[PDB]
Amino acid sequence: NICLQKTSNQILKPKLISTLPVVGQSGTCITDPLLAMDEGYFAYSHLERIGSCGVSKQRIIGVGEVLDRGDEVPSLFMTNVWTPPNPNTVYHCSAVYNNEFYYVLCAVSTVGDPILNSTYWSGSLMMTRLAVKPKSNGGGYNQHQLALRSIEKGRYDKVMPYGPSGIKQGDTLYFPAVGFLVRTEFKYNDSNCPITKCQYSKPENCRLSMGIRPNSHYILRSGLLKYNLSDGENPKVVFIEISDQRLSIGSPSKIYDSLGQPVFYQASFSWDTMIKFGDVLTVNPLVVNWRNNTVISRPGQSQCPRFNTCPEICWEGVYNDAFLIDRINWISAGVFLDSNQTAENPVFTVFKDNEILYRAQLASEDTNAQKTITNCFLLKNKIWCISLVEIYDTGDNVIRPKLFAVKIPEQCT
Ligand SMILES: *[C@@H]1O[C@H](CO)[C@@H](O)[C@H](O)[C@H]1NC(C)=O
Ligand SMILES: *[C@@H]1O[C@H](CO)[C@@H](O)[C@H](O)[C@H]1NC(C)=O
Ligand SMILES: *[C@@H]1O[C@H](CO)[C@@H](O)[C@H](O)[C@H]1NC(C)=O
Ligand SMILES: *[C@@H]1O[C@H](CO)[C@@H](O)[C@H](O)[C@H]1NC(C)=O
Ligand SMILES: *[C@@H]1O[C@H](CO)[C@@H](O)[C@H](O)[C@H]1NC(C)=O
Structure with missing residues (x-):
């Protein structure tokens, strides 16, 4: 039982918790965060850059336990950390937990960020497996690279992990992902672009905004990468595209279990800026019963600001x-930047489709903030959420992820 009523009472008490100590050291910038959680365990990643936010010094990928720290508040206890040999080659990591291991799928690139340099990326992927409870002298039990024998990608030129975390269904993992499709092969009818109440929107705007520029070589399509642990000695990776219902440019996404059924979230990196999420009807093919949410959006820039609904040509927004x-009342929790066109003012928010119930400001109105990743769970039958929030210090000119733990209150006063 949680508070089901709208209230201005400050019933949410966010607690500042803390994974690694380097996150706090002066002289290093911490970017490209990942946080994933399942079954009492977590996976975490960041990129450390000496000085500017840059020149990569170290990629860390670690796992551990979520435990009560001593005073009934959960925190993260790191248990097993892996450092890739060249931090400049590893991008877009995504984590799924299964049967005592976390599996982490990343892109390997000798040509930079594959999203920004798509035409030259080889499409190379790597799969690393990390024991959540390692063994002293555990060799290939503690950390192990898995051989990817084959990548089934259909009509897509390349496919890639794209989002912090996914789910397992028995022996099969599903990572959030994106497919790179040659723009000339994209099948789209401009009549489907919804411009009826949008006098300034051209019919072609949906189609042109399916890539990061209107004249891009590729369009981006979100979906899943399926990895079945029982599928032979070296399982294949299979791309599953998201349906064309409420289609938005392929963007960082997340599939997660909540209350026994999966839910899918897709970031709004274009003109469709109201929150894109809902229960998954089927995983393969991927159909999402998108919420008709009228209260939660995200900051953008001029053409696609917060609360924008009209088709425009733009690539902007934040995860x-x-x-x-x-599920019975469809209530959710997250951290949203309470601003129209600047990445500012992170607020922990509990909300329904058409109603914000209650909230708590995590910093100040002028506190610059960016990516937020929220996961909730039971601790002694009380609902807790942990949110990673990138806080940008404009004075210091440095981003650092902060971790907050918030108990969802039972009562409204
Ligand atoms: C982008 O791709 C080209 C392809 O050869 C490469 O030369 C260049 O290094 C890449 N740019 C960055 C910033 O990595
Ligand atoms: C294109 O889409 C519209 C959707 O209303 C449909 O009426 C039309 O028959 C479609 N066919 C085309 C563009 O070939
Ligand atoms: C995974 O692989 C096993 C063995 O081939 C098969 O029995 C099972 O149906 C597969 N599951 C999925 C979801 O593909
Ligand atoms: C959202 O709205 C559509 C109509 O555009 C409706 O068909 C669908 O059932 C609604 N989704 C919900 C309630 O999850
Ligand atoms: C932010 O955008 C909304 C919707 O257009 C508008 O109502 C509101 O006035 C804007 N806020 C500010 C502070 O300009």
């Missing part, structure tokens, strides 16, 4: 996910 905490 601020939401986690379902009550």
Whole structure:
């Protein structure tokens, strides 16, 4: 039982918790965060850059346990850390937990960020497996690279992990992903671009905004990468595209279990800026029963600001996910930047489709903030959420992820 009523009472008490100590050291910038959680365990990643935010010094990928720290508040206890040999080659990591291991799928690139340099990326992927409870002298039990024998990608030129975390269904893992499709092969009817109440929107705007520029070589299509652990000695990776219902440019996404059923979140990196999430009807093919949410959006720039609904040509926005905490009433929780066109003012928010119930400001109105990743769970039968929030210090000119733990209150006063 949680508070189901709208209230201005400050019933949310966010607690500042803390994975690694380097996150705090002066002289290093911490970027490209990942946080994933399942079954009492977590996976975490960041890129460390000496000085500017840059020149990569170290990629860390670690796993551990989520535990009560001593005073009934959960925190993260790191258990097993891996450092890739060249931090300049590893991009877009994504984590799924299964049967005592976390599996982490990343892109390997000798040509930079594959999203920004798509035409030259080889499409190379790597899969690393990390024991959540390692063994002293555990060799290939503690950390192990898995051989990817084959990547099934259909009509797509390349496919890639794209989002912090996914789900397992038995022996099969599903990572959030994106497919690179040659723009000339994209099948789209401009009549489907919804411009009826949008006098300035051209019919072609949906189609042109399916890539990061209107004249891009590729369009981006979100979906899943399926990895079945029982599928022979070296399982294949299979791309599953998201359906064309409420289609938005392929963007960082998340699939997660909540209350026994999966939910899918897709970041709004274009003109469709109201929150894109909902229960998954089928995983393969991927169909999402998108919420008709009228209260949660995200900051952008001039053409696609917060609350924008009209088709425009734009590639802008921020990843601020939401986690379902009550299916019977469809109530969710996340951290959203309360601003129209600047990445500012992170607020922990509990909300329904057409109603914000209650909230708590995490910093100040002028606090610059960016990516937010929220996961909720039970601790002694009380609903807790942990949110990673990138806080940008404009004075210091440095981004650092902060971790907050918030108990969802039972009462409204
Ligand atoms: C982008 O791709 C080209 C392809 O050869 C490469 O030369 C260049 O290094 C890449 N740019 C960055 C910033 O990595
Ligand atoms: C294109 O889409 C519209 C959707 O209303 C449909 O009426 C039309 O028959 C479609 N066919 C085309 C563009 O070939
Ligand atoms: C995974 O692989 C096993 C063995 O081939 C098969 O029995 C099972 O149906 C597969 N599951 C999925 C979801 O593909
Ligand atoms: C959202 O709205 C559509 C109509 O555009 C409706 O068909 C669908 O059922 C609604 N989704 C919900 C309630 O999850
Ligand atoms: C932010 O955007 C909304 C919707 O267009 C508008 O109502 C509101 O006035 C804007 N806020 C500010 C502070 O300009």
